[PDB]
A paper describes a structure:
Type IIa receptor protein tyrosine phosphatases (IIa RPTPs) function as presynaptic organizers. The vertebrate IIa RPTP family consists of three members, PTPδ, PTPσ, and LAR, which share the same domain architecture with a large N-terminal extracellular domain, a single transmembrane segment, and a cytoplasmic domain. The membrane-proximal phosphatase domain (D1) is catalytically active, whereas the membrane-distal one (D2) is inactive. Liprin-α is an active zone protein and the first protein identified as an intracellular binding partner of IIa RPTPs21.
Here, we present the crystal structure of the complex between PTPδ D2 and the tSAM domain of Liprin-α3. The final model was refined at 1.91 Å resolution with Rfree of 0.208. The D2 domain of PTPδ adopts an α/β structure, which closely resembles the reported D1 and D2 structures of IIa RPTPs (Cα rmsds of 0.59–1.23 Å over 244–287 residues). The pseudoactive site of PTPδ D2 retains the catalytic cysteine residue (Cys1440). However, the tyrosine residue in the phosphorylated Tyr recognition loop and the aspartate residue in the WPD motif, which are critical for the phosphatase activity, are replaced with Leu and Glu, respectively. The interface between Liprin-α3 and PTPδ D2 is located on the opposite side of the pseudoactive site. The D2 domain of PTPδ interacts with αN, SAM1, and SAM2 of Liprin-α3 but not with SAM3 in the present crystal structure of the PTPδ D2–Liprin-α3 tSAM complex. At the interface with SAM1, Tyr1373, Leu1380, Phe1399, and Phe1430 of PTPδ form a hydrophobic pocket, which accommodates Trp856 of Liprin-α3. At the interface with SAM2, Phe1430 of PTPδ hydrophobically interacts with Leu978 of Liprin-α3, whereas Arg1397 and Asp1433 of PTPδ form hydrogen bonds with Glu976 and Arg971 of Liprin-α3, respectively. Taken together, the SAM1 and SAM2 interfaces are critical for the binding between PTPδ D2 and Liprin-α3 tSAM, whereas the αN interface contributes little to the binding.
Residue numbers in the entry:
A (entry chain B): 807 to 906, 943 to 1114
B (entry chain A): 1212 to 1250, 1254 to 1507
The structure:
C-alpha cells in the first residue's frame, strides 16, 4: 500500500483548514468568503464536483448562498434533483444555526453513505440503497422526506416498506440521532432479549434462528423487518411475522412456537 | 517473464523498456506489446447476417462467454445482440461494459442495454466526429425529450468541466413508467491523433467517474465506449484497474492486466502508443505520492 503524503492530501488538508478556521473562529456563515463556501460544499455537505464548480463560478459568499431561492439554486448551482436541493437547504440552515469543533468537523458520520451502506441494510431495506444514495439522502434529511419523494424518487411504493422506514426513523429520533449510542445498544443486546427497539434485521433473524426456526430466518432478508418495527408497531403480530417468514400453515407447531416466543419477546424486550 | 513491478522500480522499468539493447532492432516496449499477441472464446451471435450491420468494424466482435445480451423481442431474430462485452474491475465483477460508439441503427439497442443491465454511468472517450469521420452517433437528446423505442430519454442538465462534459438524463420505461437517472461523462481532451501529452487529466477523469459510482451507490457496470470499444476503452479500463491496485498493493503489472482484459474482449488497448501511455500515466500517478517520486 502506498504510504506518505501527496498532492491529493495536501489539497484536501488546505481545503479543510479553510473550513476549520471559519468555524473555530466564530465566523457566521453569512460572512464566509467564496473559497470557504466552496470547501464547505465539497467537504461538509458532500456535493459532487460539478455542483461545487458551479458554486465556485457563481456564488462568491455565504450571504449569497444563504439567500438563494429554490429556482436560483437550480440556476446558479445547477441542481435539478429536488432531493439534492433539500440536502443543500437543510445544510445551509444547519450551518447558519451553528455559526451563531463541538459541531463535528468529522462530517459524514451519518451522511448519505452511512444511510446507504449501514443504516438502510440494518432495517432490512438494502434494496433501496442505490436510490437513497443517488438522491444523497443523509440522516438530517430523513425526517423531512415527504410522501411524494418517498413514493416517486425513492421508489418506496410498498406500504409496509414505508412503515418500516418510519419506525426506523422514530428509533433514530428517540436516540437523538446518536450513531455511537445506536451501535453500543445493538452490541449490548446481541445475546439477550433486551432493548428490542434498537435491533437490526440481522439480529431479528438471529432471534428467529435461536428459536429453532432457522430455515425460515433468511426469508426476512429485504423484508423491512427490524427491532424498532417490532417494538413500536402495535399492529404487527406473530401472524404477520409468520407470513414474512413464510412458515407453512401446515407447520402448526412452528406457528405455535413463534406465537409464544413473540409474546415473550415483546413482554421482555419492549413496552408494548 | 516477470512484468509485475513494485512501485519503487516503475521508473527504472519504464526506462529499460524505452531502451533497445543486446542485438535486437526493437525496444523493450515494442517487444512486450507484441508478446500480448500470442495470448479466447467464440464469435457466434456477432456473425449472424441479421447482425452484421450492428457492428462498426467486422473484425471487432464480442466473445460469446462475456457478451452483453439483450432480452429477445418477439419474432425479431438478432434482437438480443449488441456489440458489447462485460469486463471485471479491481473490486467487483462486471464493473464495466466495453462497447462501440453506437450507430444510428443500434441507438435504441444501446439504451435498452443500459436499462436491462442497470448501467447508469456511461463514459464516452471520443468526440462525435474526429479526423473527418463519425466515431459515434449522437444517441442522446439535445434539448427536448426523445423516444428510443420503449424508453423516453429526457435531458436533465449539462455541466462543462475542464476536461470533460457531464450530461444527465432521466430515462423512463414507457411500458410501466419506471424511471432512472443516467449520467454520461464525455472526456473531451483525448487528441485526435496519438495519446495525451500528460496523463493527469485522464487520471482525474477516471477518478471522477469512479467517485460518482461510489457516492451515488450505483452498483451496475460503467458503460465505456470509444470508436470500436477496444482502444481508448482498453486504456480507460486498464488504468482504472492498475491505478487502484497500485494504490492499495504497491505494485504494477500492466502486461498481465491487458492480457486479462483481452480474455474478455478482443484487442483491448489496440496500439503500442496506447500501451506505452498506460505506463506513462501510471508513473505520473505514482509521482503524486511523495515517497515514490
Amino acid at each position: 500500500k502506498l504510504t506518505g503524503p501527496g498532492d491529493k492530501d495536501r489539497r484536501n488538508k488546505r481545503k479543510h483548514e479553510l473550513l476549520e478556521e471559519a468555524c473555530r473562529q466564530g465566523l457566521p456563515f453569512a460572512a464566509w468568503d467564496g473559497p470557504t463556501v466552496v470547501s464547505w460544499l465539497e467537504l461538509w455537505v458532500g456535493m459532487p464536483a460539478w455542483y461545487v464548480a458551479a458554486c465556485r463560478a457563481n456564488v462568491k459568499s455565504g450571504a449569497i448562498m444563504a439567500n438563494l431561492s429554490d429556482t436560483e439554486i437550480q440556476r446558479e448551482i445547477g441542481i435539478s434533483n429536488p432531493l439534492h436541493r433539500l440536502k443543500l437547504r437543510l445544510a445551509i440552515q444547519e450551518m447558519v444555526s451553528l455559526t451563531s469543533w463541538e459541531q463535528i468537523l468529522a462530517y459524514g458520520d451519518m451522511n448519505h453513505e452511512w444511510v446507504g451502506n449501514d443504516w438502510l441494510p440494518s432495517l432490512g431495506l438494502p434494496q433501496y440503497r442505490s436510490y437513497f444514495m443517488e438522491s444523497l439522502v443523509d440522516a438530517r434529511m430523513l425526517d423531512h422526506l415527504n410522501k411524494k419523494e418517498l413514493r416517486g424518487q425513492l421508489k418506496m411504493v410498498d406500504s409496509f416498506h414505508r412503515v418500516s422506514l418510519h419506525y426506523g426513523i422514530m428509533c433514530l429520533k428517540r436516540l437523538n440521532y446518536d450513531r455511537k449510542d445506536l451501535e453500543r445498544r445493538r452490541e449490548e443486546s446481541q445475546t439477550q432479549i433486551r432493548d428490542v427497539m434498537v435491533w437490526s434485521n440481522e439480529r431479528v433473524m438471529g432471534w428467529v434462528s435461536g428459536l429453532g426456526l432457522k430455515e425460515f430466518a433468511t426469508n426476512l432478508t429485504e423484508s423491512g423487518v427490524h427491532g424498532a418495527l417490532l417494538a413500536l408497531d402495535e399492529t404487527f403480530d406473530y401472524s404477520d411475522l409468520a407470513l414474512l417468514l413464510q412458515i407453512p400453515t401446515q407447520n402448526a407447531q412452528a406457528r405455535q412456537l413463534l406465537e409464544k416466543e413473540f409474546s415473550n419477546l415483546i413482554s421482555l424486550g419492549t413496552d408494548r | 517473464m516477470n512484468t509485475e513491478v513494485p512501485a519503487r522500480n516503475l521508473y527504472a522499468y519504464i526506462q529499460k523498456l524505452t531502451q533497445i539493447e543486446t542485438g535486437e532492432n526493437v525496444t523493450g516496449m515494442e517487444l512486450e506489446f507484441k508478446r500480448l499477441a500470442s495470448s479466447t472464446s467464440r464469435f457466434i451471435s456477432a456473425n449472424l447476417p441479421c447482425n452484421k450491420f450492428k457492428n462498426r468494424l467486422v473484425n471487432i466482435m464480442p466473445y460469446e462467454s462475456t457478451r452483453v445480451c439483450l432480452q429477445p423481442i418477439r419474432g425479431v431474430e438478432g434482437s438480443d445482440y449488441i456489440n458489447a462485452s462485460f469486463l471485471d474491475g479491481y473490486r467487483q465483477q462486471k464493473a464495466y461494459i466495453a462497447t462501440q460508439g453506437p450507430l444510428a441503427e443500434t441507438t435504441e439497442d444501446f439504451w435498452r442495454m443500459l436499462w436491462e443491465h442497470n448501467s447508469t454511468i456511461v463514459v464516452m472517450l471520443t468526440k462525435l466526429r474526429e479526423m473527418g469521420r463519425e466515431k459515434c452517433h449522437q444517441y442522446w437528446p439535445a434539448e427536448r425529450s426523445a423516444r428510443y423505442q420503449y424508453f423516453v430519454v429526457d435531458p436533465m442538465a449539462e455541466y462543462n468541466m475542464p476536461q470533460y462534459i457531464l450530461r444527465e438524463f432521466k430515462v423512463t420505461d414507457a411500458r410501466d413508467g419506471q424511471s432512472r437517472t443516467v449520467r454520461q461523462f464525455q472526456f473531451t481532451d483525448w487528441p485526435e491523433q496519438g495519446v495525451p501529452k500528460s496523463g493527469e487529466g485522464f487520471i482525474d477523469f477516471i477518478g471522477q467517474v469512479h467517485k460518482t459510482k461510489e457516492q451515488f451507490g450505483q452498483d451496475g457496470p460503467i458503460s465505456v465506449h470509444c470508436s470500436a470499444g477496444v482502444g481508448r476503452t482498453g486504456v480507460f479500463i486498464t488504468l482504472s484497474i492498475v491505478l487502484e491496485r497500485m494504490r492499495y498493493e504497491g505494485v504494477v503489472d500492466i502486461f498481465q492486466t491487458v492480457k486479462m482484459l483481452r480474455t474478455q474482449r478482443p484487442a483491448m488497448v489496440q496500439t503500442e502508443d496506447q500501451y506505452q501511455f498506460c505506463y506513462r500515466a501510471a508513473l505520473e500517478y505514482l509521482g503524486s505520492f511523495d515517497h515514490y517520486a
